[PDB]
Amino acid sequence: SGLVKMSAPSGAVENCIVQVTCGSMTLNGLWLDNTVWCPRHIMCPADQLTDPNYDALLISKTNHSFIVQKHIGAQANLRVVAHSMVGVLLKLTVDVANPSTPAYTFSTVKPGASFSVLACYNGKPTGVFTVNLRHNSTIKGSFLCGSCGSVGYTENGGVINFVYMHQMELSNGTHTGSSFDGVMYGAFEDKQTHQLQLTDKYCTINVVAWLYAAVLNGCKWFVKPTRVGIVTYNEWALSNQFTEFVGTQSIDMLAHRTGVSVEQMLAAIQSLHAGFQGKTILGQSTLEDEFTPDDVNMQVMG
């Protein structure tokens, strides 16, 4: 028992982290097979990040403009033999295939999904933590200068799913990056200019999962016979900055295990959003929306 924010073991990803340098800019990259992926702003001098012309910056480069170093494990300088730009990423081709390339996929996560982040600096992994893609397609992580190129991933059945490459900090504690097709989460542009973030929302399905976790951890004071139907709840959610509830098998597994219906949990959300009134749930006095149904299922007795 217990419920904690849990990340996927990072070793398979650590074996793929490299450092990339272009002029005076250095950041992290991901080395899979003969490819190294990194943010394209490595091409932009630090004092020109306000409105770069990446097409023009790309034309001025050659393969010799990029230096790649494997810093951890068996150290090696990897020779760049080709380069191209894919959205907000550079795709470098190196002469050596990573001998520790894991089985992997590239996926783009949807708002409400969780993933692990391996924070890196100068091609050295320094920390692991878990985030959720917010309703406005940002993440609430912990990143400092030099973290660009840090990798977000999940793991299942021995396969690493690479979902994020860190690109920038939008505002305090708010970050974004790209999927490995080079598309930025939230369509933010990789430039220093002020960019508006859309309004965020509480992820209903995740709050429901968390309330089921609370019941399975002996906290059930908030469960009442009271029900709110999904259609009615969804009309309320549209006015109270909550997401629409759409049923899933993972939630149905928790409803069946606990004997508490989804409609009872939706009624609990409405009551708890008005206030907890001097009470706590799993030590919290506010709703938690960053655990997914699958994340909760992983931490409950089978």
**Residues with catalytic annotation?**
41, 148
Q: Closest approach of Cβ 131 to Ni ion, in Å?
A: 18
Residue ranges in 110-129 that form contacts with a second copy under rule CB under 8 A: 118-119, 125-129
Among 218, 231, 249, 259, binds a second copy (CB under 8 A): 218
**Backbone φ, ψ for residue 142 (5° rounding):** -145, 100
Report CA-CA distances (Å) from 173 to 133, 169, 202. 13, 8, 17
Tokens 């943010």 -> residue: 39
43 in contact with Ni ion (CB under 5 A): no
Q: Which does 7 bind (CB under 5 to 8 A by kind): a second copy, Ni ion, none?
A: a second copy
Size of the site for a second copy (CB under 8 A): 46
| Distance in angstroms (rounded) separating the CA atoms of residues 167 and 183 | 11
Binding region for a second copy (CB under 8 A) out of 21-29, 62-70, 139-147, 180-188: 139-147
| Distance in angstroms (rounded) separating the CA atoms of residues 22 and 118 | 22
One-letter amino acid identity for 91? K
159 in contact with a second copy (CB under 8 A): no
Q: Running DSSP on this structure, what letter comes out for residue 199?
A: P
Per DSSP, helices labelled H in 44-114 are: 54-59
| Distance in angstroms (rounded) separating the CA atoms of residues 39 and 27 | 8
Looking at the Cβ atoms of 8 and 80, the one nearer to a second copy is: 8
Q: Closest approach of Cβ 6 to a second copy, in Å?
A: 4
148 in contact with Ni ion (CB under 5 A): yes
User: Are 85 and 58 spatial neighbours (Cβ–Cβ below 8 Å)?
Assistant: yes
Tell me, residue by residue from 43 to 62, as one string, x for binding to a second copy by CB under 8 A and - for no binding: --------------------
10 in contact with a second copy (CB under 8 A): yes
22 in contact with Ni ion (CB under 5 A): no
User: Are 38 and 97 spatial neighbours (Cβ–Cβ below 8 Å)?
Assistant: no
Q: Which of 170, 114, 161 is nearest to 143 (CA)?
A: 170
Structure tokens at 258: 């606990």
Looking at the Cβ atoms of 42 and 131, the one nearer to a second copy is: 131
Q: Running DSSP on this structure, what letter comes out for residue 198?
A: P
Binding region for Ni ion (CB under 5 A) out of 101-109, 118-126, 142-150, 292-300: 142-150
Binding site for a second copy (CB under 8 A): 1-12, 14-15, 118-119, 125-129, 131, 140-145, 169, 172-175, 217-218, 276, 280, 283-286, 298-302
